[PDB]
Design an enzyme around this catalytic site. Structure first.
Site, PDB file in Angstrom:
ATOM      1  N   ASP A 190       0.816  -1.203   0.000  1.00 33.68           N
ATOM      2  CA  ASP A 190       0.000   0.000   0.000  1.00 33.68           C
ATOM      3  C   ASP A 190       0.859   1.267   0.000  1.00 33.68           C
ATOM      4  OD1 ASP A 190      -1.593  -2.155   1.190  1.00 33.68           O
ATOM      5  OD2 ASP A 190      -2.916  -0.686   2.149  1.00 33.68           O
TER       6      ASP A 190
ATOM      7  N   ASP B 246      -3.265  -1.120  -2.658  1.00 30.38           N
ATOM      8  CA  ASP B 246      -3.906   0.180  -2.836  1.00 30.38           C
ATOM      9  C   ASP B 246      -2.861   1.281  -3.008  1.00 30.38           C
ATOM     10  OD1 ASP B 246      -6.566  -0.582  -0.495  1.00 30.38           O
ATOM     11  OD2 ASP B 246      -6.781  -0.359  -2.642  1.00 30.38           O
TER      12      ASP B 246
ATOM     13  N   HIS C 127      -3.933  -1.666  -6.605  1.00 25.96           N
ATOM     14  CA  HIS C 127      -5.360  -1.972  -6.551  1.00 25.96           C
ATOM     15  C   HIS C 127      -6.249  -0.736  -6.598  1.00 25.96           C
ATOM     16  CE1 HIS C 127      -4.499  -6.098  -4.411  1.00 25.96           C
ATOM     17  NE2 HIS C 127      -3.869  -5.976  -5.561  1.00 25.96           N
TER      18      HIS C 127
ATOM     19  N   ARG D 113     -12.535   2.713  -6.148  1.00 22.92           N
ATOM     20  CA  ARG D 113     -13.043   1.680  -5.261  1.00 22.92           C
ATOM     21  C   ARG D 113     -13.422   2.218  -3.888  1.00 22.92           C
ATOM     22  NH1 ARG D 113     -10.082  -3.927  -3.176  1.00 22.92           N
ATOM     23  NH2 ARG D 113      -8.343  -2.467  -2.917  1.00 22.92           N
TER      24      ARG D 113
END
Ligand SMILES: *[C@@H]1O[C@H](CO)[C@@H](O[C@@H]2O[C@H](CO)[C@@H](O[C@H]3O[C@H](CO)[C@@H](O)[C@H](O)[C@@H]3O)[C@H](O)[C@H]2NC(C)=O)[C@H](O)[C@H]1NC(C)=O
Ligand SMILES: *[C@H]1O[C@H](CO)[C@@H](O)[C@H](O)[C@@H]1O
Ligand SMILES: *[C@H]1O[C@H](CO)[C@@H](O)[C@H](O)[C@@H]1O
Ligand SMILES: *[C@H]1O[C@H](CO)[C@@H](O)[C@H](O)[C@@H]1O
Ligand SMILES: *[C@H]1O[C@H](CO)[C@@H](O)[C@H](O)[C@@H]1O
Ligand SMILES: *[C@H]1O[C@H](CO)[C@@H](O)[C@H](O)[C@@H]1O
Ligand SMILES: *[C@H]1O[C@H](CO)[C@@H](O)[C@H](O)[C@@H]1O
Ligand SMILES: *[C@H]1O[C@H](CO)[C@@H](O)[C@H](O)[C@@H]1O
Ligand SMILES: *[C@H]1O[C@H](CO)[C@@H](O)[C@H](O)[C@@H]1O
Ligand SMILES: *[C@H]1O[C@H](CO)[C@@H](O)[C@H](O)[C@@H]1O
Ligand SMILES: *[C@H]1O[C@H](CO)[C@@H](O)[C@H](O)[C@@H]1O
Length: 339
Positions: A159, A181, A202, A235
């Site tokens: 991340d 992410d 992501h 998202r």
């Protein structure tokens, strides 16, 4: 006014013991011993920290953080040619934070007030890079995170920015190559992300929201950013059976390129996608404005898995996601939106 220079294999120790006598601390080719944090916590107000040369860390299986900073009116920057090298392939084992080796988190940006972090170049983090928590009026700008080696070497849960219990945090000019992410806002208010380039991870994510005492997300903006060669684009994830709220979230002027799984995905059953979405984490005043891009033929353009009544007041202006399958499993889609 004092300038302090710390370096080499015992730089971390000296820095820790002398940091409060330094108006400016410069960190030159510091090799942090295994199992220890570069402890820049509780700096005096207005301290300037400069990273110079190559910062490295000894190997240990432990949970970090590798670097920790806290205080007010701080400036932390990188000198030309510097890098902060986590050499994460030593830990990468395909399991990230879920199992395998214990891997240390990289950068604890906690209890920061009115500070700026600019121009840092981070290479090959073991697992998550920035953990932002308990911070107010924090700017992270022109930060480069290169975990591209992790793509074929077991990089997982890397991340770039994990944000919680923070307000007025601004992220601009981020360049991220990673495997999770690009941004995850778990909770926080007045968050601004602009001029970002997110590759390999992501997507730009709200979530996961719920199941902690901090479960409110409000007023977050992603603008003028590119998400490329990523599993997801836009998202929002809220945890099933939990309560919280997500409101006044805007994505604007976003380019999505070669998204693999979901161009746009909103899930109110995150945590258990075999179950029906629940309604405890309402997502309201969600705006997409000029969000465009392409999904690979095997991915899905849009998935909206909303609870009954728990998604409302969406505005989707000039949105176009194509290339992928149209989903037939979308539930309780609000009036302004579509799969
Ligand atoms: C939603 O979040 C927005 C982003 O944080 C926020 O806009 C920001 O508003 C603050 C005011 O609290 C501005 O910041 C301050 O700092 C600048 C210079 O550092 C001063 O000139 C300002 O007067 C102020 O002290 C931010 O500049 C601004 N950020 C941007 C990118 O717009 C909104 O206020 C939030 N909206 C709501 C309704 O709360
Ligand atoms: C620490 O040493 C360096 C020399 O590389 C200076 O930049 C600084 O002023 C401090 O004395
Ligand atoms: C890094 O640089 C400092 C002086 O700036 C030395 O004390 C240390 O031994 C290392 O060479
Ligand atoms: C850290 O270890 C180096 C490498 O052996 C030393 O030169 C330094 O002074 C400190 O002990
Ligand atoms: C790390 O090393 C420095 C200098 O050797 C000490 O001052 C500190 O207490 C710790 O042992
Ligand atoms: C870290 O740096 C301080 C100041 O340069 C030294 O006194 C200490 O021994 C360690 O090398
Ligand atoms: C960093 O290290 C110094 C001594 O190494 C401590 O005094 C400080 O509390 C922090 O652990
Ligand atoms: C931290 O750094 C200062 C400045 O070099 C030293 O005087 C102190 O002993 C500690 O090593
Ligand atoms: C810069 O900061 C240091 C300690 O934070 C002071 O000792 C110096 O006098 C100047 O205020
Ligand atoms: C420490 O030193 C640097 C360079 O002198 C400054 O940028 C800083 O404000 C502080 O005085
Ligand atoms: C850091 O971790 C390494 C590996 O466990 C040790 O060798 C070292 O003494 C320090 O604890």
């Amino acid at each position: 006014a004092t300038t302090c220079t710390f370096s080499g294999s015992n730089g971390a120790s000296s820095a820790s013991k002398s940091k409060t006598s330094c108006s400016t601390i410069v960190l030159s080719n510091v090799a942090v011993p295994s199992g220890t944090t570069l402890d820049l916590t509780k700096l005096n107000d207005g301290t300037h920290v400069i990273f110079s040369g190559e910062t490295t860390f000894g190997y240990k299986e432990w949970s970090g953080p590798l670097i920790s900073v806290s205080g007010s009116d701080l400036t932390i920057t990188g000198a030309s040619g510097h890098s902060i090298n986590g050499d994460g392939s030593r830990w990468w084992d395909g399991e990230g934070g879920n199992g395998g080796k214990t891997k240390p988190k990289f950068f604890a940006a906690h209890s920061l007030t009115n500070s700026v972090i600019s121009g840092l170049k981070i290479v090959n983090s073991p697992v998550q890079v920035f953990s932002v928590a308990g911070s107010d009026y924090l700017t992270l700008k022109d930060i480069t995170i290169d975990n591209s080696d992790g793509d074929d070497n077991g990089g997982h849960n890397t991340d770039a920015f994990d944000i919680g219990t923070s307000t007025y945090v601004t992220i601009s000019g981020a360049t991220v190559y990673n495997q999770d992410d690009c941004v995850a806002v778990n909770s926080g208010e007045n968050i601004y992300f602009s001029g970002g380039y997110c590759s390999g991870g992501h997507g730009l994510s709200i979530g996961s929201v719920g199941g902690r005492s901090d479960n409110t997300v409000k007023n977050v903006t992603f603008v003028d950013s590119t998400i490329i060669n990523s599993d997801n684009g836009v998202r929002i994830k809220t945890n099933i059976d939990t309560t919280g709220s997500v409101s006044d979230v805007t994505y604007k002027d976003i380019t999505l390129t070669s998204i693999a799984k979901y161009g746009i995905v909103v899930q109110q059953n995150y945590g258990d996608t075999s179950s029906t979405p629940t309604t405890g984490v309402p997502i309201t005043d969600f705006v997409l404005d000029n969000v465009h891009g392409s999904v690979v033929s095997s991915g899905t353009n849009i998935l909206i898995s909303c609870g009954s009544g728990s998604c409302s007041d969406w505005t989707w202006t000039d949105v176009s996601v194509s290339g992928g399958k149209t989903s037939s499993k979308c539930t309780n889609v609000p009036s302004g939106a579509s799969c």
